[PDB]
C-alpha cells in the first residue's frame, strides 16, 4: 500500500538502455554548462579589467585637469609681464602650447568613452551568459535526478556493476 511512479520502462534492458541515453544527455548538458561557466568567469575578469582601466582613464584626465589649473594660475604673471616689453610672440607660444594640451585631453576623453561603450556591451553579454546558465540548470538538475532514479532501480533489481558501468561509460 505504497507508491512511486518515476521510471518509464519496466524491463531491465529497456531501463538500462534509457540509463545510457539519460546519462549521455546529462554529460553533454554538463559540458554545455561548463563551457558557459568558463565564459562567465572570463567575462567577469574582463569586465573587472575594463572597469579599472576606466579608473586609470579618470586618474589620467584628473592629472591633465590639474595641469590646466596650473597653466591658468601660473601663466597670469608672464603673459602680463611679456605684454609690456612687447614680447607678444612668447604670449602666443604659451597659449598655442596650452591649446595643444587641451586638444590632447579631448583624445583621452574620446578613448575613455570608447571603453565605456565596450563595457556597456560586455555587461550585457555577462547578463546574457547568466541567463543562459539559469535556463540550463533545470535541465541539468532534472537529468541528474533521472540518471540516479534509473541507477537505483537497476541496483534494487540486482543488476551487476559490470552492466551498470557499460551503460554509464
Amino acid at each position: 500500500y505504497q507508491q512511486d511512479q518515476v521510471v518509464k520502462e519496466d524491463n531491465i534492458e529497456a531501463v538500462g538502455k534509457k540509463l545510457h541515453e539519460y546519462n549521455t544527455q546529462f554529460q553533454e548538458k554538463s559540458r554545455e554548462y561548463d563551457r558557459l561557466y568558463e565564459d562567465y568567469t572570463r567575462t567577469s575578469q574582463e569586465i573587472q579589467m575594463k572597469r579599472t582601466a576606466i579608473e586609470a582613464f579618470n586618474e589620467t584626465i584628473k592629472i591633465f585637469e590639474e595641469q590646466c589649473q596650473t597653466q591658468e594660475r601660473y601663466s597670469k604673471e608672464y603673459i602680463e609681464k611679456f605684454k609690456r616689453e612687447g614680447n607678444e610672440t612668447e604670449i602666443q607660444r604659451i597659449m598655442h602650447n596650452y591649446e595643444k594640451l587641451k586638444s590632447r585631453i579631448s583624445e583621452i576623453v574620446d578613448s575613455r568613452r570608447r571603453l565605456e561603450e565596450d563595457l556597456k556591451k560586455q555587461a550585457a553579454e555577462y547578463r546574457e551568459i547568466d541567463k543562459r546558465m539559469n535556463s540550463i540548470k533545470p535541465d541539468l538538475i532534472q537529468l541528474r535526478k533521472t540518471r540516479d532514479q534509473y541507477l537505483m532501480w537497476l541496483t534494487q533489481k540486482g543488476v551487476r556493476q559490470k552492466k551498470l558501468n557499460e551503460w554509464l561509460g
Binding site: 554548462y33 561557466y37 562567465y40 567577469s44 575578469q45 569586465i47 573587472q48 572597469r51 579599472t52 582601466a53 579608473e55 586609470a56 582613464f57 586618474e59 589620467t60 592629472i63 591633465f64 595641469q67 590646466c68 596650473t70 597653466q71 591658468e72 594660475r73 601660473y74 601663466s75 608672464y78 612668447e90 607660444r93 604659451i94 602650447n97 596650452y98 595643444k100 594640451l101 590632447r104 583621452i108 555587461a123 555577462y126 547578463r127 546574457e128 547568466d130 541567463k131 546558465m133 539559469n134 535556463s135 540548470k137 533545470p138 541539468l140 538538475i141 541528474r144
Partner: protein
Amino acid sequence: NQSVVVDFLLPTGVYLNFPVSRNANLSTIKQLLWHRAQYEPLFHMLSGPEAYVFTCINQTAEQQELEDEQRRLCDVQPFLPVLRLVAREGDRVKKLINSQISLLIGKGLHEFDSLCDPEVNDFRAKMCQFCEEAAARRQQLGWEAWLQYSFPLQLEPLPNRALLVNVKFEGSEESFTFQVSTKDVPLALMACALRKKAVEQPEDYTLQVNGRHEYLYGSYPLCQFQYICSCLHSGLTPHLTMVHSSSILAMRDEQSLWSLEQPFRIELIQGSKVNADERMKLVVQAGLFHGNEMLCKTVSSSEVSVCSEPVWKQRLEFDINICDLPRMARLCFALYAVIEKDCPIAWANLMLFDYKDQLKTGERCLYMWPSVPDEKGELLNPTGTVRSNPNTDSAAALLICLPEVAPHPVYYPALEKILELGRHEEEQLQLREILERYEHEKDLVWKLRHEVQEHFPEALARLLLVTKWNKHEDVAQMLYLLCSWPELPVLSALELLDFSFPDCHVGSFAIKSLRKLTDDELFQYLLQLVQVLKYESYLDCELTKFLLDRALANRKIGHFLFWHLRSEMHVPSVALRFGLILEAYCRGSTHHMKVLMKQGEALSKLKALNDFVKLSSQKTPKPQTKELMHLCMRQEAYLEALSHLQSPLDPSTLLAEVCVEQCTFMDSKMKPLWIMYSNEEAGSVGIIFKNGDDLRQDMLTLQMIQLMDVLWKQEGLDLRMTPYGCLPTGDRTGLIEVVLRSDTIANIQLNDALLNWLKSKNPGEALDRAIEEFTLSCAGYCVATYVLGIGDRHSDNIMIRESGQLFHIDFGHFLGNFERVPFILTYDFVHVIQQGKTNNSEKFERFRGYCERAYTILRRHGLLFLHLFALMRAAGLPELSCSKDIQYLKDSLALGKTEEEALKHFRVKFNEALRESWKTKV
C-alpha cells in the same frame, strides 16, 4: 613599433609630445625631455632635472612617483604614455612602498579605500601597525638572529664516518680542502678552516653554501644539514664559503541582548539585475545557520513573476528569538526560479552581528553569487563565503532590511557576562563507549559535559557539535567549559579549524594549541591553514594574526604565504581578504618585497613569452618557434627580468644567468616553457613555467608525498623520494622544479631496457646502489599512489633518476576520481628489484617489507591526513569536495580496522597486484 609617443607635463603648465624608445630608462628620458624643453616657453623657471620625479598612472590605476630612474619605460607600464614632473617631496618612503605593494599583489590599494568599509579600514590600520612594529623590532636584533629569520636552517628529520670538505673565504680564488667527520658541529669546521696559513675569530663567521642562500650554523652536526646529507649520499664533496658577521649586517641594513525575547525577522524588499526565464516565477528561500547546522526551520517567499527587478516587500519571520542568536549567526539566502504550479539562480550569506559584536540594523544590499549545480543539491549554501560579490555593477543583488530591535544599539555580551551563565556509574560506562569510537547520544554527552572536560579532553570537538547553538543558555555553558579547557595536541587543533566549528572562541582555542608548532611542522600544514581563511567570517581574526606572526618571524614561511595568497588574487571571493593580508605582510617585509617584485616581473615576462610561443606553434614548426622564442628572450628588458632572481620554488636557490640556447617549450597541451639557468658562484637549475592549466592538484599531492617522506624518515626509513617543487603563482599559472638527470620510463624503453639504462648510468660497483635506490623509491611511490588513490599511472608520467630513484610526475587525478585504485606492481619494476633474475626471494622480500613498513607508518598518522584533507575541502578542488573523497583515505588506510587486520588486507592486495603484474605484461 619600437618607439612610443609620450606626453610630458611640466610644472609650469607647459606640455610636450615626442617619441622615445620603450627600452629607454627614465633617466635617459628626462635628459631628452630637458633638451626639448629648452626650446619651449618658461624653461628658465624650471629647476634642474634632479629637482623633479616623473609621476605616472600605472596598470593598477594609481599614481606612482617613479623614484628609480634606472627603470625602463616598458617595465614601468604606465596606463597611457604620460609622465608628469612633480617635486621630490614629502615622505617618499611611504609613497614608494604603497605603489610597489599595489603592483606586487595585483590589486590597487585605492580599491580598499573605495569600499568605505570600517572593517577593511580598521584591519589595514591594526595589521599594518602590527607588521611594521615586528619589522622595526627585527631590524634592532643581531646578525645571528637576523640570519635565522632570513635563512632558517634546512635540516633532515645515525652512522659516524668521515669525509672531506672544500672551504673558501669571501672574495678569494684560493680554497682549502680537508678531512672532517660527519658528526662534527659547523663551528668546529670554521675554526679548522680559519687556520689558513698557520687575527680573526671563528664565531664572527658563518658557513654559506656557495651558489645558494643556504647557511650552516647552530648546535647541530654536519650530517643533519640537507646540503651535507645530500653530498654524503650522492658521494660528492661539499663546497662552502666563510662569510664574516659584518657582511651579514650589509645584507640586513635596509629600512542587554538576552533581554530581547522578540522573534527574529527580516524585511525582504527587492531583487535586482536578475536573469531568468520569463515563463517561470522567482522565490527567495531564507535560513539561519551556525556552521553546517540550522538554527531553525527555513522560511520562503511567495511566487512573484520573473523580471530584472522583482519586488517582494515581505516580512520573513523565523522560529527563533533574537536573544537565542549565537555570536557567529549566519543568515543565508538563495534566489530560486520555479514553475508557478527547480533552478537555484544565486545565493548570499550574511552575518547578523558585525565585526565589533553589534547586531546589525537597517538596509543591507547583498550582491549575490551564482549557484552551481552539484551532487549534494542543498537548498541553501551556508558553507559559502559571507563576503559580497565584488562585481557590484553587473551582478544580481537582493535588498533586505533588519528591523530596529531597540532604540540604542545592541552588542553580543562580552566574555565576562558570558561566564556569569557558566558557573551555573551507568552514565560513565555509556559515555566512554560513545567516545571510544546520534540524538540519544547527543543528549547524554551534553548532560555529562563536565565529565568530557575532565576525562575525555580530546573529545572537545564531539562536544561542540552536540551543543544546541540555537539556545543561548547552552551556548554560554559550553563557552564556560571551553575557556578553562585543557590545551590539546596539534592534531586535535587542526580538526577545530574546520567549518563545523565557526565560534571564535573555538577558533581562538585552536590557534592557541597551534602556537607550539615549529616552523618546519607549520610549513607542512601552511597550505591548509591558508585555505581555512575562506571559512572565516570577519577579516580581523586569530588565524590571520597567527599567520602574519609566523611569516614575519620566518622569511621562508612568509615567502610561501605570499605566493599561496598571491596565486588566488584573481578569485573574487577571496581577492579582498587575501589582498589585505599581502599588504600587511609587505609592510612588515620591505626587504623581501624587493625579492618578490623581481620574481613577479619574471613571471610576468614568462607569461608574455609563453603566449607568444602558443600562437607561434600554430603558425610554424618547432625549430623556428624555438629560435623566435630565443630572439624575444635576448631583448634587454626580457633578459634582465628573467636573470638574477631567487627561485619562487625555493628562495634559497639562486636563478642567475638564463641559458637561452638550452631554453625551449615542451610538446604538451599548454606548451610549458623549459627555462634553464646556471650560476658561476656555484648546480645547473631548471624550471618549467606552465600557463593555462591548473597546478593546485599537483602541489597538494607533492605536499602529501613530502609529508609521508618526513613521516617515514622520523622512523629511520629513507625511501629515497623525490618531492620536487611545485607552486601555483597566479591564474592557471605556476612553476615546477626540473629534476636533472631523469627521464620518463617510456623514452628509456623506446631508445631488459630499463635495467640496461641503469647499467649505463651506474657501471660496475655503482649498479648495486642504483637498484637499491629504485627498490626503495618504488616501495614509497607504490604506497603513496595507493593511499592517495592516484590512478592514470603509465610510462609517460613515471620517471627515473640516473641515481636509480623512481618518482612520479603530473598528478592530475587522485582519490579514485577521473572508484578504488588497486595497489599496483609493474613487471618491469619487479624485474629491476630482483636484479634481472627470474626469482630473487631475498631482494623481493625486503621490497615487500619496505612497502609494508611504509603503509603501517601512514596508518599511525591517518587522522593527520584526514584532518589536513578535511581543511582542503575549502580550496574547491573538483576531486576534493565532500566526505566521500575523505572516506577514500579512511578506507585506503583501513582506519576502521585494527593494525593486524589492515596489514593482512594490504598483504592480500599486494599479493594480487603481483599476480596481476604478470597478466598486465602479456
